[PDB]
């Protein structure tokens, strides 16, 4: 079972992206073979669908504010 996006239309896209990122995370990044983003197709699709959905939601400001914050 694979996790849902808050926007159902994006779920499938999200799955593809996450799948791709997972492969990259284990095989390349952690093993020092890469510091680039090899998942930009899937990512672009996913992120476009998501940000489209995110505008309807009243949360983009708050999300941005805590993203401008550096808890580290």
């Amino acid at each position: 079972i694979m996790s849902a996006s808050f926007a159902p239309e994006c779920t499938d896209l999200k799955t593809k992206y996450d799948s791709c990122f997972n492969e990259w995370y284990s095989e390349k990044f952690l093993k020092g073979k890469s510091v680039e983003n090899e998942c930009s197709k899937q990512w672009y699709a996913y992120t476009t669908c998501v940000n489209a959905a995110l505008v309807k939601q009243g949360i983009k400001p708050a999300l941005d504010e805590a993203r401008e914050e550096a808890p580290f």
Partner: peptide
């Protein structure tokens, strides 16, 4: 560490966390 961190990025859904409705990635870069 690879197994722990990878799990963290995939920790939902799982049977012990039923109130989690969705996870989304807002941004990711190196």
């Amino acid at each position: 560490f690879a197994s722990v961190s990878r799990a963290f990025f995939n920790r939902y859904p799982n049977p012990y966390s039923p109130h989690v409705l969705s996870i989304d990635t807002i941004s990711r870069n190196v």
